[PDB]
Amino acid sequence: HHSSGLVPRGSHMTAIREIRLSEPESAQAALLALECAQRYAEPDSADFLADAAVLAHDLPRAVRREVERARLDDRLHALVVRGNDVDQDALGPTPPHWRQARTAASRRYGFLLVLYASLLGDVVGWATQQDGRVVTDVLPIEGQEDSLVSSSSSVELGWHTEDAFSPYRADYVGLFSLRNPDSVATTVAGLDPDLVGPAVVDVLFGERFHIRPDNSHSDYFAGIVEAVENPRAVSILRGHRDAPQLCVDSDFTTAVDGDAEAAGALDTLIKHLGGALYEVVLGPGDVAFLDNRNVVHGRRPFRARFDGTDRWLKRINVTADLRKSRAARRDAQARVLGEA
Amino acid sequence: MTAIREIRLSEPESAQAALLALECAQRYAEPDSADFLADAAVLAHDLPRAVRREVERARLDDRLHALVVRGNDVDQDALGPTPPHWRQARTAASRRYGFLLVLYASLLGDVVGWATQQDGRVVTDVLPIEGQEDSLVSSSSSVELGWHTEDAFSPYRADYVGLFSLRNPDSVATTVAGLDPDLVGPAVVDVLFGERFHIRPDNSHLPTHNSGGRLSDYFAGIVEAVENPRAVSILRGHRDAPQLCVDSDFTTAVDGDAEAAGALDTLIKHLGGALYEVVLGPGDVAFLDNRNVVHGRRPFRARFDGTDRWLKRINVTADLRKSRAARRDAQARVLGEA
Ligand SMILES: NC(=[NH2+])NCCC[C@H](N)C(=O)O
Ligand SMILES: O=C(O)CCC(=O)C(=O)O
């Protein structure tokens, strides 16, 4: 049966907005995704993305009302929609690399992730990430167990705002779990300003920090080298004091040269977020949208077998304002940031 | 070729949009009631599919001038006389058109208003007012409404301006112009991309166009932007598809920047000449892409007898979250309450 509710974390009373699909809602969503897979080339082909926001209107009405409430909740951490259909037998094995993960059997889950995403905003990708795919793949890769990227397993994916260095960073990160037999978590933390010295909060609102791109990441790429070598002075907190946005990377953020007070405030924040991390586990057919304006996220160490049974998610970036990134996109309809 | 995207409603589509608007009017008090606006994005999904498809094509077209939806139902007899002032224009009979404007608008983004414009109403009224004939505000008639980016002065200016024509007996034209960078040349484009201009709030944000009971402090932000405008650009974004931000009556080059003053002078002559007409008849709704075009209104003679031209108007943002510093709370839609 259909249900939805608010799951608090610390003082964040709407931290998690949880929706449980009824069996009929799960079937309705699956039928729409399967129809899209019959009519359109790819989950991120131009033909589909031109239509995706209107096709998303055919998702179950009760679900659409709850997603719309989440979209306008400026204190949201994670929207979680549980109980989508995943046919494990038909899906087949977890591929051994994202380069082999855009499979025919998994297309219907990419389509469904884009349909849910398109209720929140417009889907985008990154030229430097998984060949500029909008629907990307999160799965463990043999030989990258001890890497700083989403294909890690043995070593914690360090928490960060997604693409923290970039003015074009996503408003939401979406994750559609295809399988997760060992219940491996995404880590999540937001700032509780009532747990931090107001003077530290004041410092974090100042343009007193450098956020550099991961090595992961032409006038755009001229800006990417300038971002490593001559990083702009940016704030970590921005907006209304009652609902500040957060932008920080635990591995790639420093205070401006000689700003010892900023260095102090940054390390106070890093210790606070480190201590406030909680977990969201997505079972097969569970989809999460993290509000990238409000939370950092990462992933816990886990034990990959590399036998075709490993954890596998589809991943997407969503922007509230596609138009604002036009300088960094190839043409009006292109969704790949840094393509031109 | 597709700068103006038009859909003419079939009789069934017109009836379906009217029925949805009347269902909203039965449920909610005001067309900008908080409970309605919370629900508006999902209620808008019940508009006719053919219309939602064309609105979505318009939304993703970064060279759009205006989406025009023709032939909505307007009952002229039931509507009654055109009010003599926007303050009196929140009429029972006109509620249904307010609701329908917000439903169309909510396909493109989230609706916002201004603390300092028509007393912070989200659904506003464009109608001629006796004594404002020669003014620079939307209630003018005799003096052409100068072309402008809506709320050009503000970083929170709308992405779309929605205009729902309730009546327009003399077919008075809305004016529209975009910028062709090729026609002004790379030299002037380079200058307009520079932060070398002052854009002041227009007169409708002044206490002279709001109720006298409105707090003085609502207006401190506007008066600061009139007195001490920031140095800003007129063009931004991709060179191949630049956004436009200029008000023909409230924009100047920064003192001493003769190059900038020349570029502005060139832009004004280019836009003033290319300025073209769109007539919104009763039941016609337009959404101007406020990132791409300036707009205005041709001069006309008002009769002031209750038969005059009357539009409902709305501001639409692609990104409500970005203005949270200027809004009272998460759901509040009135810019300048913080
Ligand atoms: N150049 C101008 N007249 N600018 C102001 C335009 C009218 C303004 N949008 C109003 O609501 O009154
Ligand atoms: O693997 C996860 O749970 C999270 C991965 C992710 O969101 C990311 O790649 O940034």
Ligand SMILES: O=C(O)CCC(=O)C(=O)O
């Ligand atoms: O009256 C019109 O058609 C345009 C109105 C307008 O430009 C405005 O209200 O700012």
Ligand SMILES: [Fe+3]
């Ligand atoms: Fe205007």
